[PDB]
Amino acid sequence: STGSATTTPIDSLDDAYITPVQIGTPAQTLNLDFDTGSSDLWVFSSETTASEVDGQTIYTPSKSTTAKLLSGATWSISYGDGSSSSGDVYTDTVSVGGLTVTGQAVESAKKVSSSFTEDSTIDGLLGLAFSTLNTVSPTQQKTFFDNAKASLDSPVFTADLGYHAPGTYNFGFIDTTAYTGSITYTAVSTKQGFWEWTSTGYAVGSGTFKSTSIDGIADTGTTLLYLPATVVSAYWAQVSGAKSSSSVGGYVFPCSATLPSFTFGVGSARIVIPGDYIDFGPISTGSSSCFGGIQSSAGIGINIFGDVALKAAFVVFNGATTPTLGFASK
């Protein structure tokens, strides 16, 4: 089998992407944030504290003839940005882009943090990291991809995120029309449960390439590119007037600037992020200070190749017995 679904930016800055997902019978369609940095499929629901729901579409398991309470199971998750959610668990039929999994754990939120409430466009998350990170207790549950894998034509999914435009998530096949040149594959460590890999280096604008190993994760659920402070300082030093602002919480730059590109290495191959992809707009309405899309990972503990980087590439998440990651230009 295969599946193919369009993913759409939630706003004009590409702050996140939402993909429609069918849950239950008859189908209830919710727009979920596909997140290769976590491993829980959770949704706003009829069980979510009413004051914490503000415009989201909810899953109502009592209206699904295929929903079953997973008795005794609970979940609770905290994300890198400090957001969180928790609740109980159902199993139900879940379909993405024509690909159907029966018996999928659908984690129903009883509580969500303010950032989730305040984002009316995201109805939940669909985790695509390794199932070892799944938070369901006392019986850990599998991700949608793990459940689907044996049935797929090939044990892979691909992310093709757009810049200020829709893109595509495919399951079970590699669309050879969706990228230019060749896909370069690179080793993955699953030891922390992430799609963790080692970039071979970077360049700033038309500058020379610096060969240096940068360990990080491919994370579709993170907006920005978070890299070591040395690398990030070298980037922003090429933008007149750019500075790190502790009050804003990262590097900002004059909105009048033209940003240089940023290149990252994948083996001997190179992925070029255009300067425009690094512009996250005014820090507040009307301001002439703009927020940067490349930021230091120093406070985080891990480097993160988030959407700013991934949207410059066609990315293969290869879930074979020994997983790998593939990157192509497009």
From Swiss-Prot:
Transmembrane segments: none
UniProt domain Peptidase A1: residue ranges: 17-328
Keywords in alphabetical order: Aspartyl protease, Disulfide bond, Hydrolase, Protease, Signal, Zymogen
Catalytic activity: Hydrolysis of proteins with specificity similar to that of pepsin A, prefers hydrophobic residues at P1 and P1', but does not cleave 14-Ala-|-Leu-15 in the B chain of insulin or Z-Glu-Tyr. Clots milk
UniProt-annotated catalytic positions: D35, S199
GO process annotations (BP): proteolysis
Paired cysteines (S-S): C255-C290
EC identifiers of the protein: 3.4.23.22
Enzyme's top EC category: hydrolase
Entry's Gene Ontology molecular function annotations: aspartic-type endopeptidase activity
Family the UniProt entry places it in: Belongs to the peptidase A1 family.
Protein name (record): Endothiapepsin
Organism: Cryphonectria parasitica (Chestnut blight fungus)
UniProt gene name: EAPA
Part of the whole protein covered: 90 to 419 of 419
